[PDB]
Amino acid sequence: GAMAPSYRVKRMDIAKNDEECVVNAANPRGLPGDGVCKAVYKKWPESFKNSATPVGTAKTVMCGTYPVIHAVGPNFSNYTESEGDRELAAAYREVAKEVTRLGVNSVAIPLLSTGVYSGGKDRLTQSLNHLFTAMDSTDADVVIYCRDKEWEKKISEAIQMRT
């Protein structure tokens, strides 16, 4: 575990993380995909061997010794707000189990279902709160990756509010 487990946020490409493992915002079919998923495919293509997994689950595939945790959030275009919220929470619980199993001291994580799976809505708070619910009981240093300047400020404020 980390000596003083923490949350941090960084505004940069998650493919350039400084953590011991990465969470991919995957699609269920293990395809190269869009956004975070395509950056992860370019950096760790070997990790897409048999990476397909259902919505609400996470599947880890090693690239060398570096773990890629493929976490499948729901596409809110297809799911109801109610069912989507349940699957989004479940995906993060499966990420916490994998991070714990791997014994890493740090993990790089994106906000699941906030990009092309958002159904055209702002889901920063919804996704971040499900991340906290899952990860608060783990002792890994968690570094949350985003790309938007106002998202960085809102994520930073949410972390500091609890400290």
Ligand SMILES: COC(=O)c1ccc(O)cc1
């Ligand atoms: C924090 O998000 C990313 O790491 C990211 C990488 C590549 C993209 O095209 C989009 C987002």
Ligand SMILES: Nc1nnc2ccccn12
């Ligand atoms: N998760 C995330 N980081 N930056 C952005 C920007 C728009 C929508 C989602 N985002």
Ligand SMILES: [Cl-]
């Ligand atoms: Cl960058």
Ligand SMILES: [Cl-]
């Ligand atoms: Cl997304």
